[PDB]
Write a protein that binds this DNA or RNA. Structure first.
Lengths: 126, 231, 231
RNA sequence: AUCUCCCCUGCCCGGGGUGCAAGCCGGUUUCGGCGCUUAGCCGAAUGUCACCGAAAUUACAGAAGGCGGGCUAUAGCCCCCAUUUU
RNA sequence: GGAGGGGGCUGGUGACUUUCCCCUCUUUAAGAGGGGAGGAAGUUCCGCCCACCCCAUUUAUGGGCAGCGUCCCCUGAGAAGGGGCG
RNA sequence: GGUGGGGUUCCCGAGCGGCCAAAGGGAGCAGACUCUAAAUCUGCCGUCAUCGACUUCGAAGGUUCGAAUCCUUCCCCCACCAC
RNA sequence: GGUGGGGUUCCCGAGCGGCCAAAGGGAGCAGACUCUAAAUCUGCCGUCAUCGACUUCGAAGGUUCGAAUCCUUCCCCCACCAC
C-alpha cells in the first residue's frame, strides 16, 4: 500500500479556502476551470509564486467554486483572480465572495445555508 | 468605496449594490452630454438603493482653449477627468488646478508615467492621479509588465510627494467591473496595505468634497446658513 | 563546490573547471561498472586540473536483498545513490544508515516527498537528501509548480529536523549542467541564503568525510599512523 | 527474586464494566440539534506588521467535553552546582 | 570567563480586515466593541464531574490508598537522575 | 480523542532468564538425483562457508551470575470507530 | 560639474515705479463689405460684452504713497559642453 501520514499542524502548510464565483451566462467544465486557473496562476506567480501560495481547486459544480490557498498569501491569490482577461473566444468572470478556513463555514456565509459532510460518507461507504 | 464606469443596464448595477458597493461615478467620455442621461442616472440610482455622481471627459484637443472650454463645460457637472499621453496637455491639466483626478499616462505615452517636475507641480496645484485597470485587461504579457512597471514608478512618485491616488477599473461593460476587495488586495500586493486603504479613503473624500462644494452656497470653503442676504 | 553528473567528453569538463568548479562526482546509473570507466575518469581529471570521486546507483529492485547486494557493490566504490518513488524501498534505504545522499521523492511518487516518520528516521540514521534539477528542465508549468511545492515541503522537513541537503543538477549532457552561483541564488530565492550556503558546505563535507574514511586505515573514525601492527 | 495469606498504623465509604465518536432528541438506512465551552472547530477557525520590554514567537512544538497527578523534548533570561583554569 | 544539568515564566498595547473566526448591538448594509493555542495541548499511565447495564443498599463483613520528609541501592565531571518502603 | 495488541534471518512465522537452545517454512548456493528439468533428501544457511565458533531478536538505560525474555523511557506497525 | 540668459492674453512677442499706460501681431465673435467667399477696415478683445470699469504680467515675502518693474527666496524654460 502507498500511504503518507499527514504532517502535524505545527509543521503542515497553513491553508485558507477562498470561495468565489465564475460569473458568465456561458458554461464551464471543472477541467476548464483548472486549466484556466493554472494558466493564470502561472501568468501572475511564476514557478516561485506557485510554489509559494499553493494553488489547487477543490470544488466546482455551479459557477460558484472553492479553491485552496496558503494563509499568508490570500491577497496574492485574489490578485491572481483579477487578471483573467480571455479564454479562447471569450473571458470568464471571477468574483470572490470571501475566504475562510473550512468548507462548512465558507459554505454557509456566502454559498448556501446547510452544512454537508460528504467526504466521510464516500470514504466509509465506498 | 466609489467606482468609475459607464451605465448600460440596470441588472449590472443591481449586482454592484448587492456585493459591497455604496456608490459610483457615471462616466461620460463624449462631447454630447444632456440632462436625459443624467435623469436616467437618477432613475437607476433610485431604482434599488444608490447615489451616483456624474462627470465629463475630454481627449486630444488644443492646449488652453481646451482649458477654457473644459472649465465652461465643467461648470454644469460635478467632477471631471482629462486623459491623454501628451505631456504638453498634461502640464496644462495639472497647472489649471481645478481637475479632480487624472488618468492615462501609460498607454498614450509608453515611455514613463509622471515626471518629477510634473509631480512637484501636482503637489503645488493639488491634482490627483487616477489609476485605471481596463488597460490591464486589454494587453499582452510584456505589455502588462511595462504597464505595471509604470504604475509602480507612479506609485513611488505619488508616495514620496503625497500625491492623492484614486483606483478604478475604468469599466465599459457588464463584466469589466471588479471587486473592491480585489483592488485592495492588488494594491496590497504592489507596495503596502495602508496606502491601499488610503487610496479608497481619498476616493471617498474627493467626491465628498466636490459634493460639499457644489451642494450649498460654498465659495472657497465658506458656509452660509439661515437668513441669507443673497441677491 | 561539488556537482553530480555523467562524463561524455573532455571539453565540457574543461569548461566546468574554467568557471568556478573545484571538483565533481561521476554518476554511474547502471549495473555494469568496471575499472576502465574509472581510469578514463582519472585521465580526464588529470587532463587539465581536477579531482573526481566516482559513485554507483540502483533503481527498482527488491527490498533488502537489494540492500545486501547494494552494500556488496558499494564496498568497491566511494559514494552511492538510491533513487525511487516507492516508499517501501525508501524506508529500507533510510534504515540501512550507510547511503550518503538520497534522491527522487517527487517524480516516481507525485503525491508528497518525505514523510514525517521518514524524516525522523532519517534524523536517527543520518542520511542526506539530494535535490535534483534535470526534473525541473524536463517538465511543464504546473508540473514545475507541483515539483517545487514538493521541494519546498522537503526543504521545511529538512530545516526543522536538521536533515543534510545536497543540491545538484543531475545532468546528462554537455549543456544540462548549470552554474553554482545560479543554484545558490535559486536556493536563496526559495527560503534563505544561509541555508543555501549550508547546502554547499554539507555537499563538500560529505565527500570530504567519505574520502577521509576510505583514504587510510579508518574504522569507525579511528586514525592509525606510522609503525602499525597490521596483519 | 516472585506469588499467596494472616500481624500493624491512619483516612474514606455503594462495588464492577465501558467510555463523549459515551449517552439523549427530531428523524427511524443516512443526516440535523443537546453534552459544548468567560477559544470551541469538526473537509479540524485562533491572520499580518511595528514597538515598550528583554520573558517573547524564537526550540520542542498545536486544542476537540472539562479538571488534577506523573513521564518525554528544548528556545530567551534569572538562580544554583561541577571540571579546566588562574 | 567556556561545553553541560535542574527549577521559574512565555505575553501586553496600537493599526488593518467581519474578506481569519465567534458573540453582542444599533443602523438608508454595513460598522463598532470584546475575546481568540500552552506548559506541555503530545504520549494515554491514571483518577474524578457526566451517562448507561448488573449485583447490592453495606463503613457487620469487606474494599481502596498512604508509611511521606528521611533512609537504602545503582550510574555519572558526584551537583543530579531512577527504583523502593514495616 | 479512545481500546486490545505486535516488532526475531532476504520474505511469512514460533520461542521456559542460560550451552549461534535461537521451532522453522519459503528463498540463495552447493551436494545428491536425472539424458535434461521438476519433485524429495542433505549441508552452508549472516560471516569463516569441512566439524565448530562468533553477530543480529526496533533503540537506549537499568536489574541480574548472565538479557529476545524482567523494569523504565523513546519509537514505529496493526485492527476499528463521525451516524 | 559649468557660463550668458528668458517666464506678460488661446499662440508668437514689446514694454520709463504710476491713469486695464499693459506696443502689439496671428486667433474667436460681431459689424462693414460682397450674389457667396477670400483680402482690407472697425469694436469686443478675460469678464460685464454700447462708453467705461475691474483681473492676470511664474509663485511667495519685503521696500514704497503705489509693484510686470526694485530686493530676497522658491521654481521652471533655453543654448552649448565627454574628445
Amino acid at each position: 500500500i502507498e500511504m503518507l501520514k499527514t504532517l502535524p499542524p505545527t509543521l503542515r502548510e497553513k491553508k485558507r479556502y477562498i470561495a468565489f464565483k465564475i460569473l458568465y451566462d456561458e458554461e464551464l467544465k471543472e477541467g476548464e476551470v483548472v486549466n484556466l486557473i493554472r494558466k493564470a496562476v502561472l501568468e501572475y506567480y511564476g514557478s516561485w509564486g506557485t510554489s509559494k501560495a499553493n494553488p489547487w481547486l477543490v470544488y466546482y459544480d455551479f459557477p460558484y467554486g472553492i479553491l485552496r490557498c496558503q494563509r499568508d498569501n490570500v491577497d496574492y491569490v485574489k490578485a491572481s483572480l483579477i487578471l483573467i482577461r480571455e479564454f479562447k473566444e471569450k473571458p470568464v468572470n471571477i468574483i470572490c465572495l470571501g475566504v475562510s478556513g473550512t468548507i462548512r463555514k465558507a459554505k454557509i456565509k456566502f454559498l448556501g445555508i446547510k452544512k454537508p459532510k460528504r467526504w466521510f460518507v464516500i470514504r466509509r461507504e465506498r | 468605496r466609489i467606482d468609475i464606469n459607464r451605465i448600460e443596464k440596470e441588472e449590472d448595477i443591481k449586482l454592484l449594490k448587492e456585493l459591497k458597493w455604496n456608490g459610483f461615478v457615471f462616466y461620460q467620455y463624449d462631447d454630447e452630454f444632456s440632462k436625459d442621461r443624467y435623469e436616467e442616472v437618477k432613475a437607476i440610482a433610485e431604482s434599488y438603493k444608490l447615489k451616483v455622481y456624474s462627470g465629463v471627459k475630454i481627449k486630444t484637443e488644443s492646449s488652453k482653449q481646451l482649458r477654457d472650454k473644459v472649465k465652461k463645460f465643467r461648470n454644469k457637472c460635478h467632477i471631471i477627468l482629462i486623459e491623454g499621453g501628451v505631456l504638453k496637455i498634461n502640464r496644462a491639466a495639472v497647472e489649471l488646478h481645478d481637475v479632480d483626478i487624472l488618468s492615462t499616462p501609460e498607454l498614450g505615452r509608453k515611455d514613463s508615467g509622471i515626471d518629477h517636475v510634473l509631480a512637484r507641480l501636482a503637489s503645488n496645484h493639488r491634482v490627483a492621479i487616477e489609476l485605471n485597470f481596463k488597460t490591464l485587461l486589454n494587453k499582452d504579457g510584456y505589455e502588462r509588465a511595462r504597464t505595471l512597471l509604470f504604475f509602480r514608478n507612479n506609485l513611488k512618485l505619488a508616495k514620496k510627494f503625497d500625491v492623492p491616488v484614486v483606483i478604478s477599473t475604468d469599466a465599459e461593460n457588464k463584466y469589466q467591473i471588479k471587486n473592491p476587495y480585489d483592488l485592495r488586495a492588488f494594491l496590497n500586493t504592489l507596495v503596502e496595505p495602508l496606502y491601499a486603504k488610503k487610496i479608497m479613503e481619498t476616493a471617498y473624500k474627493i467626491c465628498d468634497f466636490r459634493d460639499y462644494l457644489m451642494r450649498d452656497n460654498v465659495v472657497r470653503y465658506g458656509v452660509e446658513i439661515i437668513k441669507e442676504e443673497k441677491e
